Every structure is written in C-alpha cells, then in structure tokens.
C-alpha cells in the first residue's frame, strides 16, 4: 500500500498537502494550490485575483474595459463576503464568460471547457458528459454551473478557498483522462480562444466559432495521439528539467525525409528487440564470473577474524587495518560506484537505450511520411 487515499477524498487531518501531490508533477510547475489567507492585505488580494483570472478564464488577455464588467462582483470578494468558490460561481455566470465560452460554442466544447475551468480535470468518460448535457437542456446555464460546483468533487478537493488548478492526481481511473487533461491545457503560451479557433473564424477576431477537436475521442473509446501530449503540454511547463535516458520531448519533424532511411531504421529496431529478448534470459543467471566461487571463497575468508586493532602482523611487522563493514570483505569505494555507470556498461541496458531512441527517431518519420503529392525529395 504505497498510496493511502486519493485526492477525490477529503484531506486527512495529518497532512498539509495530499499524499498524491508530494511526488506527482504537482511540486514542479506553477499548477499548485493558491490559498487565500484569512486576513489579507489589499496587496495580496490581487495575488488571488490574478490566479483566478488566469484559471477561470483560462489564459485570457482581458483589457480593463472588459474588467469594468466584473468590478461589482470582485468587490464582494475584496470586502470578504464572497468566498473563492462563490467568486468563480459569480464569474462563470457573468456575461464575459458567456460571450467567450458559451456564445459561439458547440455543447461538447462548452462542457469540456468548464470541466477545465471550474475543476482541474478533463472529461472523464462519456456518461458524465451526457448527464451535464441533459442538465443544461432542461434547466439552463445557471443551474448547469451549480451542477459543477455544488456536488461532492469540488469541496473535497478545493474546499471553498483554494483557487482551481490543473490537478496532477497520479491516480487516473480511465487512464486516457491524463492525456485529455494534458491536451486540454495546451501549455503556458496557449489559450482557449486560440485552441478553440474563435479568432481565425471570427470577424475582426470577435464573433468566433468555438469549435472543438477530440469529440470523437469522447464517444468512442479512442485515446489521444501522443503528439498532443508530448509537444504542447503542461508536462513540459511542469517538467523536472533533468537528464532522461530516453528524452521524452519530441524533435520537430524533418523536412525532406525519404523511405530508404525509414526502411533501414525499421530493420534496426527489429534487430534490436530480437537481441533484447535473448539477452534477457542470460541475465541474472550467468551474470557473473565470480559467482560460483562466491560460495566457495567465503569459508577460506572466514579464518583469522579478530575484534581489536593491530592484528595480522604477518611475520615481524606490526601494521594492519580491517575492522569495517564494507572493508571486512575486501570492498573499496569503487565497489558501490559500479551501479552509477550501468547505462553505458551493462550489456543488457545498452540495447534498451538504443531500442528506445531508435523508436523515438522512427515515430517522427512517419508523421513526416503523411505527405505525398507536391513533395520534393533530396538525396540525403
């Protein structure tokens, strides 16, 4: 049992943050919990408000002409009457949220947008999308928003005072939901006006169709392609910035690719997996030369064992050392350091590195091999 409770459950009284958040991608990037303290400077109220406008509108410019709408409902929060959840309820039912995210949108786009705004998550399966569609169609937009906020999942996670944030749970039931979450927030330099296409389709950028991709992925269980999860993503806005043995970030696809290099690379990977699957069986059986003699040499070494200092004079000369857990058995500082070069020294591990990087080079070439007719070629 390495994970005790999830984050959908309310937080325990023993932990300051949830246990899932301590070793997920939560500790890395700016997708963290911003709690409003109980008495606030007018300085530090704006720290909360900027995070709210960053989250609820989901990366929007918002000129101060478009802020004089919301100067009434921010004032009830600045006084200290509105909580943070009632502030996002008042902001979702305002008109600037409507004209941006409801008033040119297909219903799938609006539902998947307020899943990302009011909660930190993607649409999970189809059955939870349909219940919100039927919630809107009989009761309206106003009760549709309260269907998101006033249920179990908001108050156990955010409470009433953390601003919503993109949740890096670590425990995903439907799996793909992680890929949908990473493809819904498109990294730090994206927005929903751009990803929804509401500006190119719009007239002078206003009155845009808020269209949506990935609605074939909601209905049929057909999961998100890897390029929208690895290229533009919060995975690389909240990256660990370390040395990975396979680098997971995709290279940009090369112009002027040929089929000959793809054929030789596809032969290389097929040689490498066949070499790996036979190098596996020999490992942990014939891995060592001094392994049969490990049981033999122990009884020769067991003689002349002494406690105090100075023994093994070996004739007239006095000096001796021994007495050390690692040293009693002949090991040095280099004996534990052999595990730190295994990437480039273990015969099995070399194949596993070069298998993964030949795969990563392979995967980008057929993305470049999707374009045929007016496509000029070279000779390498």
């Amino acid at each position: 049992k390495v994970v005790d409770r999830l984050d959908s459950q309310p937080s325990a009284a023993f932990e300051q943050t949830k246990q899932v958040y301590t070793f997920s991608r939560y500790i890395l990037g700016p997708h963290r919990a911003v709690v409003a303290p109980v008495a606030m400077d007018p300085s530090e109220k704006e720290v909360v408000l900027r995070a709210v406008y960053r989250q609820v509108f989901g990366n929007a410019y918002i000129m101060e002409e478009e802020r004089a709408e919301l100067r009434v409902m921010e004032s009830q929060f600045l006084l200290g009457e509105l909580s943070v959840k009632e502030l996002v309820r008042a902001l979702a039912k305002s008109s600037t949220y409507k004209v941006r995210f409801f008033e040119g949108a297909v219903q799938y786009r609006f539902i998947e947008l307020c899943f990302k705004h009011l909660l930190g998550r993607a649409p999970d399966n189809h059955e939870e999308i349909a219940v919100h569609m039927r919630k809107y169609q009989q009761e309206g937009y106003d009760a549709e928003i309260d269907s998101y906020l006033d249920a179990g999942e908001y108050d156990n996670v955010f409470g009433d005072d953390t601003v919503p944030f993109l949740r890096f749970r670590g425990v995903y039931t439907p799996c793909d939901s992680f890929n949908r979450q990473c493809a819904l927030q498109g990294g730090w330099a994206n927005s929903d006006k751009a990803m929804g296409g509401a500006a190119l389709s719009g007239y002078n950028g206003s009155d845009g169709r808020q269209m949506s991709t990935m609605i074939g992925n909601y209905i049929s269980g057909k999961p998100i392609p890897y390029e929208k999860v690895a290229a533009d993503t919060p995975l690389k806005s909240t990256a660990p910035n370390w040395y990975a043995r396979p680098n997971p970030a995709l290279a940009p696809q090369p112009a002027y690719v040929s089929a000959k290099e793809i054929a030789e690379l596809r032969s290389r990977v097929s040689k490498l997996e066949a070499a790996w699957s036979v190098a596996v069986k020999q490992s942990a059986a014939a891995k060592d030369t001094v392994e049969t003699w490990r049981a033999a040499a122990k009884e020769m070494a067991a003689m002349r064992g002494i406690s105090p200092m100075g023994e093994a004079y070996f004739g007239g000369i006095a000096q001796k050392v021994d007495n050390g857990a690692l040293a009693q058995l002949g090991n040095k500082a280099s004996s534990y350091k052999k595990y730190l070069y295994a990437i480039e020294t273990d015969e099995v591990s070399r194949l596993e590195v070069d298998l993964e990087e030949a795969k990563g080079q392979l995967r980008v070439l057929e993305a470049a091999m999707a374009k045929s007719t007016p496509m000029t070629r070279t000779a390498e």
Partner: protein, 161 residues
C-alpha cells in the same frame, strides 16, 4: 600545433598588423598562468598511472564491459584501453601546457570516431572514463589547474561524441 602565443602572433600576422594592446592583453594573460600550468603538468606527470587506475576503478572496472562479451574482456583489450587512457591524459597535459587545443585536433581527434566505430569500441563508456579521469585529475591538481585540465578533457569528449 599552435599554443596561445603562436595563435596571437598568427592572428596579428594574418592582417599585416603589429601586436597591439589586445595581443598584449592575451599574452600577459598566458604569461601570468604559465607557472601554475607548469606546476600542474609536473604533478600530473608524477601520478599518471595512479590517475588512470583510479579512473578505471571508478568508471568501468566492475561493469559488464569487462566480463565475457564486453569490449575489453580479454587481456589484449584491457591493455589497449588503458594505453588509450594514457594517451588521452598525456595529450590533455600537452594542451594544458600550450593553452590551445589544436594539438588535440591534429594528433588525437582526427579520425578517432571512425577508428572506434570500425573497431566496435563503445563511445559512451570511453567518454565516461574520460570524465572520471577529469575528476581525479582536478582532485590531484587543485581547483584552478583542474578547471584548466577539464577544459581539454571536455574538448576531447566533445570531439569524440
């Protein structure tokens, strides 16, 4: 090969110029560090065998490359690789004394990757052994000389990769 002095003189001569204030700046810079360079070169000449022994012990001595199937399994291959490491250390010392890595380009790196690829010598393990040698060498010669030697060690590793 050209050292720092030769490089400055060449840069000045290739323009028909006399050695002006910037050349004097570089020349003074080399002349101030020359004595530290001589000290480091002497100390490295003193302890070459122990440096190579310790680098090999910390980098690839107990890995799988020394076991059957590994590059340097047999005694021929072990001796050949320790000779290679001796080459790298000696030429890095030459480059540190000269203050210029052109000797490494002319006498070491020219056609080395191709030879290793034809022989089947693993490049990553070699770079790793050179990095371990950089640790021991900087350790033995102190911070400034270690920084100087590590410059040319990293030059060799970049030319090999």
């Amino acid at each position: 090969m050209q050292d720092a002095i030769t490089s400055v003189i060449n840069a000045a001569d290739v323009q028909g110029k006399y050695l002006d204030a910037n050349s004097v700046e570089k020349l003074r810079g080399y002349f101030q560090t020359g004595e530290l360079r001589v000290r480091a070169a002497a100390t490295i000449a003193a302890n070459a065998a122990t440096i190579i022994k310790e680098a090999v012990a910390k980098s690839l001595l107990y890995s799988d490359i020394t076991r059957p199937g590994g590059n340097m399994y047999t005694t021929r291959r072990y001796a050949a690789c320790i000779r290679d490491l001796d080459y790298y250390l000696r030429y890095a010392t030459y480059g540190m004394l000269a203050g210029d890595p052109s000797i490494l380009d002319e006498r070491v790196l020219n056609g080395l990757k191709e030879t290793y690829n034809s022989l089947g010598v693993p490049i990553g393990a070699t770079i790793q052994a050179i990095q371990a040698m950089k640790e021991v060498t900087g350790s033995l010669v102190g911070s400034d000389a270690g920084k100087e030697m590590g410059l040319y060690f990293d030059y060799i590793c970049s030319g090999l990769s």
